[PDB]
Amino acid sequence: SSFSGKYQLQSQENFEAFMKAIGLPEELIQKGKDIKGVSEIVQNGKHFKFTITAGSKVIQNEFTVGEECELETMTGEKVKTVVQLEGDNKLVTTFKNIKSVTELNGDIITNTMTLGDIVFKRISKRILE
Amino acid sequence: SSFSGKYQLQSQENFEAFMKAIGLPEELIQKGKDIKGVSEIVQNGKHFKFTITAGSKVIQNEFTVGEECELETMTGEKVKTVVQLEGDNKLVTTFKNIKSVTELNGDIITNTMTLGDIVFKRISKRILE
Ligand SMILES: CCCCCCCCCCCCCCCC(=O)O
Ligand SMILES: CCCCCCCCCCCCCCCC(=O)O
Fold this sequence. Notes:
Chains A, B: Keywords: Acetylation, Cytoplasm, Lipid-binding, Phosphoprotein, Transport. Chains A, B: One of its GO terms (molecular function) is antioxidant activity. Chains A, B: This is Fatty acid-binding protein, liver. The structure is a homodimer. Helices cover 12% and strands 59% of the residues of chain A. By secondary structure, chain A is mainly β. One palmitic acid is lined by residues 7, 9, 39, 52, 54, 59, 61, 71, 73-74, 95, 102, 109, 111, 122, 124 of chain A.
């Protein structure tokens, strides 16, 4: 019902292949690929504040679902898009050639980003506090 | 006794002045100054693994107290130094012209980095898992 939480990265698939595909340098990818950090979400109805930690980067994004937003991506580009909420537990958006699905089941968020033939999946678990 | 834990940044003083003094690019200072993320410490006796969230960066360092180590700093530069345990509750290191003190007070960690006339102070709080 609510995405709010601190989420500890448990596992991921295709981090290196996805980061290479969007153009990050290999020296940066290798430094970040084994980090398992904590991302935070604060949901207030349609409003979301994301403090995303991915590899060596922290990205702070804020959006209201249904409204055009500007999202900072892993390349540093800020992309104009709209994030939608499907049901109460799936956030969906597209930007550039990437399809992103953020799904909350119980305490586990599965984030699936698809770029051509690369499916970049992150499994994170809410810290019980 | 143990530093082990995940800690959320609560407040900080003189981030911009300190980051300017070490020459962090202005764009990273502005992007990172308001981010309050999660840092992790794993302590095994004298050995420490740090996953530090500072501004828009995540930095991983490992060291053994009393042994010469090579640490990555906020600019990405690597420094050769030694980290000491002071009075059993403070980790202390000096590198270049910076003195860093990491002090554990129950669930509160305070990190104080002194660079000339600038005292960069971070106060964080243990996440109760
Ligand atoms: C356009 C949105 C932000 C783009 C940043 C891409 C880096 C990976 C995004 C995954 C974060 C999704 C939130 C769940 C928590 C997590 O997996 O850290
Ligand atoms: C030895 C290099 C330090 C890393 C450079 C970034 C400066 C911030 C370091 C503070 C981290 C200390 C651990 C406590 C938690 C925290 O304050 O994030």
